[PDB]
Enzyme design. Structure first.
Site, PDB file in Angstrom:
ATOM      1  N   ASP A  39      -1.064   4.819  -4.996  1.00 26.85           N
ATOM      2  CA  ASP A  39      -2.221   5.707  -4.986  1.00 26.85           C
ATOM      3  C   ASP A  39      -1.764   7.135  -4.724  1.00 26.85           C
ATOM      4  O   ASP A  39      -0.956   7.376  -3.809  1.00 26.85           O
ATOM      5  CB  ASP A  39      -3.230   5.267  -3.922  1.00 26.85           C
ATOM      6  CG  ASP A  39      -3.862   3.956  -4.248  1.00 26.85           C
ATOM      7  OD1 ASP A  39      -3.955   3.615  -5.420  1.00 26.85           O
ATOM      8  OD2 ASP A  39      -4.284   3.294  -3.256  1.00 26.85           O
ATOM      9  N   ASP A  47       0.834  -1.208   0.000  1.00 22.52           N
ATOM     10  CA  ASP A  47       0.000   0.000   0.000  1.00 22.52           C
ATOM     11  C   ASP A  47       0.867   1.256   0.000  1.00 22.52           C
ATOM     12  O   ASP A  47       0.997   1.949   1.018  1.00 22.52           O
ATOM     13  CB  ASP A  47      -0.939   0.012   1.198  1.00 22.52           C
ATOM     14  CG  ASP A  47      -0.233  -0.257   2.511  1.00 22.52           C
ATOM     15  OD1 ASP A  47       0.821  -0.916   2.472  1.00 22.52           O
ATOM     16  OD2 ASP A  47      -0.754   0.147   3.589  1.00 22.52           O
ATOM     17  N   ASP A  81       1.068   4.812  -0.732  1.00 18.14           N
ATOM     18  CA  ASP A  81       0.107   5.898  -0.889  1.00 18.14           C
ATOM     19  C   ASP A  81       0.734   7.252  -0.572  1.00 18.14           C
ATOM     20  O   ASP A  81       1.456   7.382   0.420  1.00 18.14           O
ATOM     21  CB  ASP A  81      -1.079   5.750   0.031  1.00 18.14           C
ATOM     22  CG  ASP A  81      -1.735   4.404  -0.088  1.00 18.14           C
ATOM     23  OD1 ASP A  81      -1.748   3.838  -1.203  1.00 18.14           O
ATOM     24  OD2 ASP A  81      -2.249   3.929   0.956  1.00 18.14           O
TER      25      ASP A  81
HETATM   26 NA    NA Z   1      -3.060   2.043  -1.857  1.00 18.15          NA
END
Ligand code: NA
Ligand code: CL
Ligand code: NA
Length: 324
Positions: free
Chosen positions: A248, A193, A195
């Site tokens: 992201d 993840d 981000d």
């Molecule tokens: Na993410």
DNA sequence: CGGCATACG
DNA sequence: CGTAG
DNA sequence: GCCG
């Protein structure tokens, strides 16, 4: 032990790893069957064990702990007595669990799509590849990159990614900033993840920013696949080659930045619990943009995450203690 | 029994 | 429907 | 599945 996960520190590593992992298998399986209430209970019970100061060694020690009823207690009892819980092991071995886990891991595939494919008889990634017309463009990219995306990246990889993003952001809007969020902000040393949260100190200057950042990253050749949130697959350099990584990018105005930082830092359970606490205990409505008082019809201003915890009457928890 | 977080792409 | 935390 |  307080009942909401946002009321207690939860470190990344703890003293009940095997017990929590077993309960999380049952939570995940409940999600694959659409049983969101059971998923939440098993997630909450697992999180309680993460928050304990020492190992559970005897069933007695679950007495009084929130979210431990007959079912979660039985799972723990079996693990303490025998080292394995038959229900958990049956889930692990089942064709349904293994296939739903495989399919939902694909970027672009959720429980509902995975379940439909399962009911159609599909079982493997190559089954899916043999009917690409049945796939969205997003799922095609998820399938092509699945192997790379299944391997986590290291914090050193994250720091390299952040420098390339900062270069593009600086050209897109001088003075804009880039903050690492997600699990890496909570202290993870590796993970999937990656981000980033982007803002600018002058309210309003961030309008229109994300397309300009994306265009510049694309022009650099870094975007294998791709408003205020962009779900991307990036090329990450590796010795002699590269791999795909999910990144992201999120833009928020500085007024909303503390709320977006809080939400995007997680964990998922922590945020759900914080929003539940806000609404049910304090009568305030929380999201990643703000905190609303529905009786005054006013939004709280926050200049920091510390402000938000204070607004909610919660002791402050640093990111490293939000691993619910 | 009702409730279970709350958004954007 | 998917995505995020 | 568990809580209030
Ligand atoms: Na993410
Ligand atoms: Cl349920
Ligand atoms: Na997925």
């Amino acid at each position: 032990m307080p009942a909401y996960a946002c009321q207690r520190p939860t470190p990344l590593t703890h003293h009940n790893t095997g017990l929590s992992e077993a309960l999380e298998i049952l939570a995940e399986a409940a999600g694959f069957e659409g049983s969101e209430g059971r998923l939440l209970t098993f997630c909450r019970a697992a999180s309680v064990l993460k928050a304990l100061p020492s190992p559970v060694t005897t069933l007695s020690q679950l007495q009084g702990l929130p979210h431990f009823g007959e079912h979660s207690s039985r799972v723990v009892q079996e693990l303490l007595e025998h080292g394995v819980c038959e229900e958990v092991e049956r889930v692990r071995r089942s064709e349904r669990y293994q296939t739903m886990k495989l399919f939902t891991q694909i970027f672009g595939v959720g429980v509902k799509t995975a379940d439909r494919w399962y009911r159609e008889g599909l079982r493997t990634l190559d089954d899916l590849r043999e009917q690409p017309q049945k796939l969205t463009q997003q799922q095609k990219a998820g399938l092509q990159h699945h192997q790379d995306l299944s391997t986590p990246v290291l914090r050193s990889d994250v720091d390299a990614l952040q420098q390339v993003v900062e270069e593009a952001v600086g050209q897109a809007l001088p003075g804009a900033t880039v903050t690492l969020t997600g699990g890496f902000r909570r202290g993870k040393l590796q993970g999937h993840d990656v981000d980033f949260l982007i803002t600018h100190p002058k309210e309003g200057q961030e309008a229109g920013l994300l397309p300009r950042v994306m265009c510049r990253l694309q022009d650099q050749g870094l975007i294998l696949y791709h408003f205020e949130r962009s779900f991307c697959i990036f090329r990450l350099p590796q010795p002699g080659s590269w791999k795909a990584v999910r990144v992201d990018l999120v833009v928020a105005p500085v007024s909303q930045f503390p709320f977006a930082l809080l939400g995007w830092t997680g964990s998922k359970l922590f945020q759900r619990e914080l929003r539940r606490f806000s609404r049910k205990e304090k009568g305030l409505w929380l999201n990643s943009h703000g905190l609303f008082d529905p009786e005054q019809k006013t939004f709280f201003q926050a200049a920091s995450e510390e402000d938000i915890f204070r607004h909610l009457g919660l002791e402050y928890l640093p990111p490293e203690q939000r691993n619910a």
